[PDB]
Amino acid sequence: GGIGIAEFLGGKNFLITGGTGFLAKVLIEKILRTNPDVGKIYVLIKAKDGDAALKRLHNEVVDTELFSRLQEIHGKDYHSFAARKLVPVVGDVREANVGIAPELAGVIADEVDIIVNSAANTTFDERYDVAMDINTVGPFRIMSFAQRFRRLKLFLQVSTAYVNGQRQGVVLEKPFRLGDTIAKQHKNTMLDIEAEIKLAFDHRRHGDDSASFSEEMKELGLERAKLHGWQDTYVFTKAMGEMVINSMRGDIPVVTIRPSVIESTWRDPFPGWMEGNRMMDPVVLYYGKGQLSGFLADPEGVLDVVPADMVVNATLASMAKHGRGGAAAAAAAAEGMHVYHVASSTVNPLAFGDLSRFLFQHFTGSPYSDAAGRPIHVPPMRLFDTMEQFASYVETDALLRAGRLAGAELCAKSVEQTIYLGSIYQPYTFYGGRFDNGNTEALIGEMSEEEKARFHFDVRSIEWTDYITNVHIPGLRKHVMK
Numbered sequence: 500g501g502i503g504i505a506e507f508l509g510g511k512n513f514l515i516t517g518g519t520g521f522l523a524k525v526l527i528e529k530i531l532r533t534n535p536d537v538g539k540i541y542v543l544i545k546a547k548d549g550d551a552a553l554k555r556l557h558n559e560v561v562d563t564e565l566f567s568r569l570q571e572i573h574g575k576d577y578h579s580f581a582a583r584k585l586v587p588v589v590g591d592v593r594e595a596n597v598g599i600a601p602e603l604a605g606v607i608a609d610e611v612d613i614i615v616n617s618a619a620n621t622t623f624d625e626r627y628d629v630a631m632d633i634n635t636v637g638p639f640r641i642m643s644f645a646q647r648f649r650r651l652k653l654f655l656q657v658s659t660a661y662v663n664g665q666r667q668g669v670v671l672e673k674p675f676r677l678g679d680t681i682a683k684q685h686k687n688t689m690l691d692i693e694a695e696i697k698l699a700f701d702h703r704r705h706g707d708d709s710a711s712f713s714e715e716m717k718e719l720g721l722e723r724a725k726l727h728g729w730q731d732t733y734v735f736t737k738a739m740g741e742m743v744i745n746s747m748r749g750d751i752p753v754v755t756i757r758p759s760v761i762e763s764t765w766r767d768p769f770p771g772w773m774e775g776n777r778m779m780d781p782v783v784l785y786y787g788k789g790q791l792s793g794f795l796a797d798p799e800g801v802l803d804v805v806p807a808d809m810v811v812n813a814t815l816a817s818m819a820k821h822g823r824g825g826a827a828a829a830a831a832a833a834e835g836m837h838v839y840h841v842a843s844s845t846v847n848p849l850a851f852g853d854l855s856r857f858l859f860q861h862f863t864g865s866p867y868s869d870a871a872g873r874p875i876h877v878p879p880m881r882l883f884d885t886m887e888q889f890a891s892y893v894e895t896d897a898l899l900r901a902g903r904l905a906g907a908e909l910c911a912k913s914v915e916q917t918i919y920l921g922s923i924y925q926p927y928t929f930y931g932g933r934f935d936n937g938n939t940e941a942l943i944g945e946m947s948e949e950e951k952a953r954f955h956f957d958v959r960s961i962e963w964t965d966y967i968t969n970v971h972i973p974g975l976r977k978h979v980m981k
C-alpha cells in the first residue's frame with residue numbers, strides 16, 4: 500500500500516535551483532541516498548564559467564559533511580556516482596532560460612521530469628529591483644522555460660508560509676492568484692504586477708551604484724510590501740512569485756511547498772545539520788556571547804519553526820503524489836496549485852517563552868568559550884511586551900559599563916543597534932499568523948507506516964525542549980565555526 504516515495508524517483512531527472520542552497524542541498528542528499536537509480540540532478544549554479552562552477556559543486560556539496568553517509572554507502576564509487584548524478588549547470592534565474600547556455604538548455608528541457616525551484620534572495624529589507632528580479636520575475640523565466648520542456652511531470656516551488664503576510668489567526672493553505680492583496684496608515688486594494696514591475700527597476704540609473712539610491716530602493720520595496728499587506732520586501736515578492744507561477748503553469752502540474760522557518764535536520768542524515776545565520780540564529784548566536792540580555796517579543800506568542808529534515812520529506816511526499824503524471828489525469832482538466840503548509844504553529848507550537856528558556860538552558864550547560872577561551876556569563880532571556888520596556892534596557896550601557904570600577908552619561912551607540920535589532924524583528928516576534936498544517940497532515944495519513952519511517956514530516960514528534968537545546972543550537976554553533 501502507501502504512496503510510493505522510494506520507487507518513484509525511479510529513474511527521473513531533476514532541474515534544481517539551490518546550489519549553495521541550505522534547503523535544496525539537503526533535498527539532493529536525501530534523493531541520491533533514498534534511491535541511487537534517480538535519473539540525474541542538474542543543479543543550476545551561479546558562476547563566472549562552468550569549470551568555475553564544478554568548483555562550487557565540489558567545495559559546497561560533494562566535499563560537505565552532509566554527504567558523508569553517501570560517501571560511505573558508495574565506496575571509492577561516490578566520487579564517480581557524484582559525477583554520474585550531479586551535472587553542474589552554470590546558470591542565473593535573473594536571465595532567460597535561467598541563464599543556461601542554449602545547446603545544454605535544450606538537452607535539459609528534453610530529459611527532465613521534475614523542476615524543484617528553491618532559488619531565492621532571502622534578505623528581509625532587500626532593495627526592490629533585486630528582490631523582484633529573483634523572487635517574483637525569476638519564477639516567470641523558469642515557468643516560461645518549463646513550458647518548452649518535453650515530459651516535465653511536476654514543477655515544485657519552494658516559498659515561505661510568511662508568504663501568507665499580515666493574515667492574523669489561523670491561516671489555511673490557499674493559493675495566491677495574480678490580483679490578490681492581503682488587506683482585511685496606508686492600503687491598496689488590487690495588486691498591479693505591472694505597476695510594481697515599473698517602480699522596481701524601469702530605468703533605475705542602471706549605472707547609479709550610490710548606496711544612497713541603493714537605500715531609496717530598499718526603502719521603496721518595504722513601502723509597497725506594506726501598502727498591499729506583506730511585512731517586508733521578501734515575503735511580498737515571494738508571494739507575487741506564487742502569483743506568477745499560478746498564472747503561467749498551464750497544463751503543467753505544480754506543487755507549492757510553504758515551509759516556515761527552516762532549522763537543523765531533526766534526525767535523518769544525522770540530527771544537527773544547518774547552514775546560514777539568517778533570522779532566529781543570529782540572535783541565539785549573539786546571546787551565546789555578549790549583547791542581548793533581553794528581546795522584544797510577546798512571550799506567549801509562537802515562532803513557527805520546522806526541521807529542514809522534515810521540509811524535504813514533505814517535499815518528496817508531494818513529488819511522489821502529484822507529479823506521478825497519468826493520462827486520464829493529463830486528459831482531464833488542469834488542477835490547482837498544491838499548497839502545503841509544512842509548519843508547527845497549529846500543532847506542537849513552540850512559544851517564544853519556552854524558546855528563551857531553552858536558550859538559557861543550553862548556554863548554561865556548556866556555554867561559549869570566548870576569544871581567550873574563558874567561558875560565558877549567560878542568564879535567562881528577558882522578553883519585553885513593548886519598545887517601552889525594551890528601550891528601558893539602556894540600563895545596560897551604564898550597567899554593563901562596570902568593567903571600570905577599580906578606582907575613582909556615557910556614549911551608547913551600542914543600544915541604538917540592540918534597539919534597531921529588535922525594532923526590525925518586531926513584526927515576526929508579534930506574528931498574528933498561525934499556519935494550518937492540514938493538507939500536509941492528510942499527506943502523512945496517505946503514507947505506509949513503512950514510509951513514515953524513512954520520510955518523517957510529523958511536526959508533532961518534535962520535543963522542542965530537546966531539539967532546540969541539544970540538536971539545533973549545537974548543529975548551528977558547529978556550522979558557524981568559520
Ligand SMILES: NC(=O)c1ccc[n+]([C@@H]2O[C@H](COP(=O)([O-])OP(=O)(O)OC[C@H]3O[C@@H](n4cnc5c(N)ncnc54)[C@H](OP(=O)(O)O)[C@@H]3O)[C@@H](O)[C@H]2O)c1
Nearest residue numbers: 517518519520521522591592618619621657659758760761
Ligand atoms: N530560511 C528558511 O528557513 C526559509 C524560510 C521559509 C522558506 N524558505 C524558502 O525555501 C527556499 C530555501 O532557501 P534556503 O534558505 O535553503 O537557502 P538560501 O541560501 O537562503 O538560498 C539561496 C539559494 O538561491 C540561489 N540563488 C540566489 N540568487 C540566484 C540567482 N540569481 N540565480 C540562481 N540561483 C540563485 C543561491 O545561489 P548562491 O549559491 O550564489 O547563493 C542559493 O542556492 C527559499 O525560497 C526560501 O525563501 C526557507
